[PDB]
């Protein structure tokens, strides 16, 4: 499924013209400030839920479990610990 240069396995290409300029002719950091702020904000906003939802759920579950475990091993939690074991 992959060939090599000259016969890479692409369907025939035709009709596309590609253009570019030398690295010495270009500003490598052109538009860096706009990208760093606006592009990153757009990219982050669109992915935020896929991180927030699972992280917040599993952090909540952990927090509840760790707090219960702590409470069960106090004096106040003696009776509930006895039942839990």
């Amino acid at each position: 499924y992959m060939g090599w240069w000259g016969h890479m396995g692409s369907p025939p290409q035709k009709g596309i013209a590609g253009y570019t300029i030398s690295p010495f002719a270009a500003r490598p950091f052109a538009g860096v400030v706009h990208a760093a702020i606006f592009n990153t904000f757009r990219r982050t906003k669109n992915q935020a839920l896929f991180v927030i939802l699972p992280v917040s759920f599993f952090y909540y579950v952990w927090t509840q479990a760790s707090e219960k475990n702590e409470w069960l091993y106090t004096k106040a939690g003696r009776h509930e610990l006895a039942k839990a074991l």
Binding site: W4, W5, G6, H7, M8, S10, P12, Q13, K14, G15, I16, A17, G18, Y19, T20, I21, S22, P23, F24, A25
Partner: protein
């Protein structure tokens, strides 16, 4: 030793330049103009080319049909071509048909009708020319090369111009173009072959005396181009032959490195598998390419303009899996112009050029083209003795110095057309412009 080129002026500032040859029976006379597509802006780009069509579409006196008949009756032919910086209109005839031909040229240049009907008719002809240059692969490659090297500059425009301009060119803008640019101080009347100079000057006084002079007469061949390292890829897997051009910014006509650049160009030279002698050429690149079957052909060029130039190579190859090798070895031969060339290669190339520059001029049209080009780019015909002296002054030190400032580690303009999947990205090509071992 060839006969002397005689040169005279008129009062308006028209130059007349002639080289007689009493051994031939034909004569080429014509008008070389120091104007071309470069003189257009973006709105009237294509005007110069458009005018060339309309120049043969009828004048104030003779109609299109009468024009045809007149030339047919003379017995020779007329020809014209427009480039970026030069326009030519010439007439090849018999010895005694020279006064007729000068009269016809003066008429089509000064007194052309440019009728709306004819404008509209040519607008379709020229539209069709846009979709048929597509076949002339070398022209496609070189037009893209100028477009990219001189990105968004007048030298970067095509001669035909865009489709949009072709549909909107009016007789007004045509008339304006030729009134501003076809002035006497920018024009040279040239005769070669069976012409008498004194006869030609009389004919010029008769026909070209009422030519406008420009307001500010600069010398002939007077122009800032800012070269862009860049690439155009026109991949077409259905084509069997890849066409690739690679160039750096080269030298203008009046550069002090003009001859040094020609010698460097001759060290790489040309190659064509169809010519029997090409497998035996002295050029290192030629030997690498022929032994390994890397290409069908290559042609080194050093194209000059008034204020800039392009120096490079044009390759054609069917070997689509070894395009990388072809380009690699080509740029490694260019590297050697900076690192390795000695008196061996330089003296050989000078020997070849000393003859080549004279050999080229082998008929009256070639001679007229030489006179006209030199007068419109340099303001004088350079005698073979002066050319022999300028070539002799090129040393190996000069070639190495020139290559080290012009080629070594420099940005290239690169155009590829056809099955160019094997052509690597810009960086890998441009990295071959230097050698890490040096």
């Amino acid at each position: 030793v060839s006969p002397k080129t005689r040169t005279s002026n008129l009062k308006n500032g028209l130059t007349i330049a002639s080289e007689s040859n009493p051994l031939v029976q034909t004569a080429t006379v014509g008008v070389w103009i120091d104007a071309g597509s470069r003189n257009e802006n973006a709105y009237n780009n294509g005007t110069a080319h458009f005018f060339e069509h309309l120049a043969f579409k009828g004048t104030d006196k003779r109609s299109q049909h009468q024009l045809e008949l007149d030339i047919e009756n003379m017995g020779g032919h007329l020809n014209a071509y427009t480039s970026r910086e030069s326009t030519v209109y010439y007439a090849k005839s018999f010895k005694d048909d020279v006064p007729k031909s000068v009269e016809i040229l003066a008429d089509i240049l000064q007194h052309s009708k440019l009728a709306e009907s004819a404008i509209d008719r040519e607008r379709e002809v020229i539209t069709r020319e846009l979709e048929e240059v597509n076949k002339q692969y070398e022209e496609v490659v070189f037009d893209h090369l100028h477009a990219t090297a001189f990105m968004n500059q007048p030298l970067g425009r095509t001669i035909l111009g865009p489709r949009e301009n072709i549909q909107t060119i009016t007789n007004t803008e045509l008339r304006k173009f030729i009134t501003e640019n076809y002035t006497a101080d920018r024009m040279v009347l040239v005769g070669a072959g069976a012409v008498d100079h004194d006869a030609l000057v009389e004919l010029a006084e008769k026909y070209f005396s009422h030519l406008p002079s420009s307001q500010s007469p600069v010398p002939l061949g007077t122009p800032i181009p800012n070269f862009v390292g860049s690439e155009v890829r026109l991949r077409d897997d259905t084509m069997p032959v890849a066409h690739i051009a690679i160039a750096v910014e080269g030298v203008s006509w009046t550069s002090e490195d003009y001859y040094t650049a020609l010698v460097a160009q001759a060290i790489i030279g040309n190659y064509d598998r169809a010519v029997g002698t090409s497998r035996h050429q002295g050029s290192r690149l030629s030997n690498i390419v022929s032994e390994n079957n890397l290409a069908n052909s290559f042609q080194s060029f050093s194209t000059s303009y008034s204020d800039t130039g392009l120096w490079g190579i044009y390759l054609t190859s069917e070997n689509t899996t070894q395009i990388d090798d072809l380009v690699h070895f080509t740029l490694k031969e260019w590297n050697r112009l900076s690192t390795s060339v000695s008196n061996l290669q330089v003296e050989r190339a000078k020997s070849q050029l000393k003859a080549g520059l004279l050999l080229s001029l082998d008929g009256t049209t070639y001679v007229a083209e030489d006179i006209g080009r030199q007068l419109t780019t340099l303001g004088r015909r350079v005698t073979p003795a002066e050319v022999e002296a300028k070539l002799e002054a090129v040393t190996e030190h000069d070639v190495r110095a020139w290559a080290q400032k012009t080629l070594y580690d420099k940005d290239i303009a690169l155009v590829g057309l056809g099955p160019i999947e094997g052509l690597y990205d810009y960086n890998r090509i441009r990295n071959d412009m230097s050698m890490m071992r040096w």
